[PDB]
Write a protein that binds this ligand. Structure first.
Ligand code: MG
Ligand code: MG
Ligand code: MG
Ligand code: MG
Ligand code: MG
Ligand code: MG
Ligand code: MG
Ligand code: MG
Ligand code: MG
Lengths: 172, 100, 131, 116, 60, 59
RNA sequence: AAUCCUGCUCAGUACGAGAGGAACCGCAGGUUCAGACAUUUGGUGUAUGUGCUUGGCUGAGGAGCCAAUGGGGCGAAGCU
RNA sequence: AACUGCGAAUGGCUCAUUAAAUCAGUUAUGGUUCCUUUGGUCGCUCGCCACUUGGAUAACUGUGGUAAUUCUAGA
């Protein structure tokens, strides 16, 4: 809930910027994960959980619950010194900036995915643990690695696997 | 007299049931209307069916029972309420005058 | 959720009702009721909260020779509200809607029956008051 | 045993009796029966119909202040001291006025001395 | 229901919040500028006579 | 007596400011030290030297 | 001699690249039909019940009457 | 801070209405009203507080109410 001055004060840093976009196949919890991150951290974002957050900037986006236009939100937060210990890259301060871009996951909006990826330098690929790797994840992964993007992977909807599927740990 | 009315009144309406008389013995209250005229004998039989639905198993707790006069558009539940509302009348006053 | 209870309809096919929105239509001419399966010679009839098909008779000429969906919001027939209350209004009136449930206008003149409001939330939000 | 209603004529309308009417201008009335409803619809003023509660009240059919002299204290004073002072001795009061008179006399002497 | 009580001889008017229509019915259907018995406010308040001076609606 | 309401009476906030008011209050008959019989409020607070002041009597 | 449909849940779930998108159990109600019933709402109303009123008639008042049910308000019971 | 007094009826904007209407010249108000300015007049009238009276009410101390407003009450 900070004002603009410290936003600039950390924006001028270059070793703590993290341009990354969330990418996945349709209906993998990209919106839900981005909203949970909006609840947790954010330059001015609260912990509001009123269904879909600012990533659904449109009334028809809330009408359908399908992401249409890609949304660029900002996140700020801090992490401890022993958390800095793992950061083998350049380091300056505990504060971090995330230029988060929520990209659409539909095949018809792969151009919007490309527009997001040209901006970003890293990608959080969301994968349903139940469905595994889907067609559009197989697509956006090709796009990102062609655009030289480091992938970080996140299996989602583990509640479905451990309750609805009743998977035991061995097969999980 | 339910658990919310607590009025010391009987099921007999104001002025008695129309075309029937005064209920004094026990009685059974039934949802809805049953066949026959007034003072018609009815047989009541334990059900041939197994009652398991919510409507059949529903608990009933009456809050209020209407006892206005069925001999027209009644508007007072009891004699006590009607007297409390209307107040004294000519017949009451002249009966007081005659009997001191 | 709890569907609406059966209420006295009173408005058959051919009824002319007032138009309670602000679209510019003065009245509506009920031509049918949604969900009516029917019977021999039995005219379809609607109560408050029922979706009907109607054509406006007086009003803006860009709507007169067209069929529109509508919802009755006030009826003059007295109906029982499942608590002994026999409610009846001063007039028959309905607003113009579409297939989904949106109201064509933006304001409603006069009260709206509680059943109609509970059936259609959009009318409930647009309603000036609830009878 | 719902909420108790009252007709225009004032009688208590029990649940399941009568009929409730709503107008386009938002006003909602309740009527005990068709006689009351027809009078209301024909727009007969209830104050002339002999058997209505409004008529009875209008024709009166069926039909003091306090002055205190408290005594409390004054902020920054003593409750005992103020009553004692206002019930002081009359001889104390006349001694006070004569001692203030001679105080004014010596004030006059000071005025004369400063004049000189 | 908050009930402000003011004593002319002492001041320090106090709020008594109550939850008993049974103990509020002695004031119900009366009017202001009338003297009603505060005896229904408990045997502590037995022998107290009060007058209604003002009131606030449910909307303020 | 209920605690709070019927006890610890606060005094009247101010003294009377009219000459007839104060004379009636103190039962003075004809000019018995009305100059000094007025109420003098002592003002005390932590960070100062406490003093006392009296109002101006009119009429 | 019962009949059919809708809403909620299942579930925006299975299925499916997506778009879309169910079903079984259950819950709340309706359509059409049937058999009753009059507590309530409405209808009727010659209880010719009670007021109101036009014309005429009993000398007037009071009380009535006739006008093929004079008209009109409200209306018990019954029937609906 | 408040009661009281005064101002807030001026200024500024715009030309919609408006065709003997507005308006200009001129003329009357001996057919009227007028805070404010100024000058008059203010012991002219014979009539147990006058060394000067009664109730309060603000502001103020205190309990609040309402989601809300330059909202307000109770003592
Ligand atoms: Mg009856
Ligand atoms: Mg036919
Ligand atoms: Mg002075
Ligand atoms: Mg058959
Ligand atoms: Mg005649
Ligand atoms: Mg006569
Ligand atoms: Mg003859
Ligand atoms: Mg003839
Ligand atoms: Mg009738």
């Amino acid at each position: 809930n900070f004002t603009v001055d410290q936003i600039r004060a950390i924006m001028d840093k270059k070793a703590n910027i993290r341009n990354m976009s969330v990418i996945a196949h349709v209906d993998h919890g990209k919106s839900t994960l981005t909203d949970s991150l909006v609840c947790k951290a954010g330059i001015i974002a609260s912990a509001r959980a009123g269904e879909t957050r600012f990533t659904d900037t449109r009334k028809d986006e809330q009408e359908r619950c399908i992401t249409i236009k890609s949304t660029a939100i900002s996140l700020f937060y801090e992490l401890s010194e022993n958390d800095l210990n793992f950061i083998k890259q350049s380091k300056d301060g505990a504060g971090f900036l995330i230029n988060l871009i929520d990209s659409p996951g539909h095949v018809d909006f792969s151009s919007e995915v490309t527009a997001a990826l040209r901006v970003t330098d890293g990608a959080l690929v969301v994968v349903d643990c139940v469905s595994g790797v889907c067609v559009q994840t197989e697509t956006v992964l090709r796009q990102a690695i062609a655009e030289r993007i480091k992938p970080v992977l996140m299996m989602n909807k583990m509640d479905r696997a451990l309750l609805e599927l009743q998977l035991e740990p061995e097969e999980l | 007299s339910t658990d919310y009315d607590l009025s010391d009144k009987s099921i007999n309406p104001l002025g008695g049931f129309v075309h029937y008389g005064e209920v004094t013995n026990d009685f059974v209250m039934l949802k809805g209307c049953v066949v026959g005229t007034k003072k018609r004998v009815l047989t009541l039989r334990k059900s041939l069916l197994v009652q398991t639905k919510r409507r059949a198993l529903e608990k009933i707790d009456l809050k209020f029972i209407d006892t206005t006069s069925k001999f027209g558009h009644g508007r007072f539940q009891t004699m006590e309420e009607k007297k409390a509302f209307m107040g004294p009348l000519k017949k009451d006053r002249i009966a007081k005058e005659e009997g001191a | 959720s709890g569907a609406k209870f059966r209420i006295s309809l009173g408005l058959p096919v051919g009824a002319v009702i007032n138009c309670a929105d602000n679209t510019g239509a003065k009245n509506l001419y009920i031509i049918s009721v949604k969900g009516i399966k029917g019977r021999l010679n039995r005219l379809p009839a609607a109560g408050v909260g029922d979706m009907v098909m109607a054509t406006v008779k007086k009003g803006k000429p860009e709507l007169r020779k067209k069929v529109h969906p509508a919802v009755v919001i006030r009826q003059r027939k007295s109906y029982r509200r499942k608590d002994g209350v026999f409610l009846y209004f001063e007039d028959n009136a309905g607003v113009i809607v579409n297939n989904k449930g949106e109201m064509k206008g933006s304001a409603i003149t006069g009260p709206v029956a509680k059943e109609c409001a509970d059936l259609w939330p959009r009318i409930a939000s647009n309603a000036g008051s609830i009878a | 045993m719902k909420v108790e209603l009252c007709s225009f004529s004032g009688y208590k309308i029990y649940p399941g009796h009568g009929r409730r009417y709503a107008r386009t201008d938002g006003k909602v009335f309740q009527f005990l029966n068709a006689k009351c409803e027809s009078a209301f619809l024909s727009k007969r003023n209830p104050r002339q119909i002999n058997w209505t509660v409004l008529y009875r009240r209008k024709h009166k059919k069926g039909q003091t202040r306090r002055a205190v002299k408290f005594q409390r204290a004054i902020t920054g004073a003593s409750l005992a001291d103020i009553m004692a002072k206002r019930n002081q001795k009359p001889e104390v009061r006349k001694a006070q006025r004569e001692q203030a008179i001679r105080a004014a006399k010596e004030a006059k002497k000071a005025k004369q001395a400063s004049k000189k | 229901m908050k009930l402000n009580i003011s004593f002319p001889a002492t001041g320090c008017q106090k709020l008594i919040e109550v939850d008993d229509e049974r103990k509020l019915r002695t004031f119900y259907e009366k009017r202001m500028a009338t003297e009603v018995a505060a005896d229904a406010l408990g045997e502590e308040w037995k022998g107290y006579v009060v007058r209604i001076s003002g009131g606030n609606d449910k909307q303020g | 007596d209920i605690p709070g309401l019927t006890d610890t009476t606060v005094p009247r906030r101010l003294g009377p400011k009219r000459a007839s008011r104060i004379r009636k209050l103190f039962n003075l008959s004809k000019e018995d030290d009305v100059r000094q019989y007025v109420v003098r409020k002592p003002l005390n607070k932590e960070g100062k030297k406490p003093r006392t002041k009296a109002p101006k009597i009119q009429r």
